[PDB]
């Protein structure tokens, strides 16, 4: 069940970095947030989609450096 | 550091993927790696930040089209009823692993392929076997050679497994032991190697697991010609590919004393990828140089 903690942490990491992509719109941040999201377990299949969808949206807005 | 390879030399790498199971990956390779390389060396402002989104769409498009070739087993082949290729399934693993930074990539797709290779295609001694060679033999680079095939292929598949490890750790239980059994086979046979290409590729595989040392490291390093390249009589392209694997191994070793003549030889090849038969050289040279630009003091 350290494996519950891992999965829980991947989720926070992804939440945190996606929130931060939304803040800077950089290629650097995009890369962090996209990997983080792809790392989240199908266990959270739902919040994974919402974060991915959130990423795609920052991409629609456009990147800046 | 050395100067980054100029973005302008890379424009032609932004390519539509088309064709079937294999050729869709031939199309996906250059754009995947060109975005990887440009992102790392930060050339997007001075080249076209907005062309990046266009490349991202093309990559998304290759990924998507590639899923139309995913078999029930999680393996890949040119066509859904073709017997699945060990090399191709491992190569899709390699490319998608690098694309996790770029687009939505489904773990179950990627780890599913990983799991299938381990479960279906690994021998008890740790060798990986190809039971259904790809149609596009020009796309497998220096593996097309017939000698030292179990070592070249095993190192190739092992490299994919090592690049999928972070992504697949929690869902593929078999992965760490599969990595070790493959390492074991490579280590036991490394000293008998004759081909520079196999030495470079198995050397990168071994180094990633800290197994390239002692007499094996000495073998690796002294196979270089003039301390700057790994080459065999054959096509130049296999040598740019082998030298790029060897540079990744050096980087893994943090042997930054050996690195700069190897980077200078590659840069002086003016090899900008793309074209018939270029898949492995294109992916590997830009993976290697991006790693170099990321790592080297």
Swiss-Prot record, chain A:
It is found in: Secreted. Extracellular fibrinogen-binding protein that plays an important role in virulence. By interacting with the alpha chain of fibrinogen and its derivative fibrin, enhances a non-functional interaction between fibrinogen and platelets and is responsible for repression of fibrinogen-dependent platelet aggregation. In addition, assembles a fibrinogen protective shield around the bacteria which results in impaired phagocytic clearance by the host. Interacts with host fibrinogen alpha chain/FGA. Interacts with host complement protein C3. This is Fibrinogen-binding protein. It comes from Staphylococcus aureus (strain Mu50 / ATCC 700699). The lineage of its organism: Bacteria, Bacillati, Bacillota, Bacilli, Bacillales. The gene is fib. The chain holds residues 101 to 165 of 165 of the full protein.
From Swiss-Prot, chain B:
Changing residue 131 to A: No effect on binding of C3d to CR2. Disulfide bonds join 111-168. Changing residue 171 to K: In AHUS5; leads to impaired binding to the regulator CD46/MCP and resistance to cleavage by factor I. Changing residue 40 to A: Impaired binding of C3d to CR2. It comes from the Eukaryota. There is a cross-link at residues 20-23 (Isoglutamyl cysteine thioester (Cys-Gln)). Interacts with CFH. Interacts with CR2. This is Complement C3d fragment. It comes from Homo sapiens (Human). The gene is C3. The chain holds residues 996 to 1287 of 1663 of the full protein.
């Amino acid at each position: 069940t350290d494996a519950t903690i891992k999965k829980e942490q991947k989720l926070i990491q992804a939440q945190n970095l996606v929130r931060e992509f939304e803040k800077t719109h950089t290629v650097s941040a995009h890369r962090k947030a996209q990997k983080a999201v792809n790392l989240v377990s199908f266990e959270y299949k739902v919040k994974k989609m919402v974060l991915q969808e959130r990423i795609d949206n920052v991409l629609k807005q456009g990147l800046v450096r | 550091g050395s100067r980054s390879t100029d973005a302008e030399r890379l424009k032609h790498l932004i390519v539509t993927p088309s064709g079937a199971g294999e050729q869709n990956m031939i199309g996906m390779t250059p754009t995947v790696i060109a975005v990887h390389y440009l992102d790392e060396t930060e050339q997007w402002e001075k080249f076209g930040l907005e062309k990046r989104q266009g490349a991202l769409e093309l990559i998304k498009k290759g990924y998507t089209q590639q899923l139309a070739f995913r078999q029930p087993s999680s393996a890949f082949a040119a066509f859904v009823k073709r017997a699945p290729s060990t090399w191709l399934t491992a190569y899709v693993v390699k490319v998608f692993s690098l694309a996790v930074n770029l687009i939505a990539i489904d773990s179950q797709v990627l780890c599913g392929a990983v799991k299938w290779l381990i479960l279906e295609k690994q021998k008890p001694d740790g060798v990986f076997q190809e039971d259904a060679p790809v149609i596009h033999q020009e796309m497998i680079g220096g593996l097309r050679n017939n000698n030292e095939k179990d070592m070249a292929l095993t190192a190739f598949v092992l490299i994919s497994l090592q690049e999928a490890k972070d992504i697949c750790e929690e869902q593929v239980n078999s992965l760490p032991g599969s990595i070790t059994k493959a390492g074991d086979f490579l280590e036991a046979n490394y000293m008998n190697l004759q081909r520079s290409y196999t030495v470079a590729i198995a050397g990168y595989a071994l180094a990633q697991m800290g197994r390239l040392k002692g007499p094996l490291l000495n073998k690796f390093l002294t196979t270089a010609k003039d301390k700057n390249r790994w080459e065999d009589p054959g096509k130049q392209l296999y040598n740019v590919e082998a030298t790029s694997y060897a540079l990744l191994a050096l980087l893994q070793l943090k042997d930054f004393d050996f690195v700069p003549p190897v980077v200078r030889w590659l840069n002086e090849q003016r090899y900008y990828g793309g074209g018939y038969g270029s898949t492995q050289a294109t992916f590997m040279v830009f993976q290697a140089l991006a790693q170099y630009q990321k790592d080297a003091p």
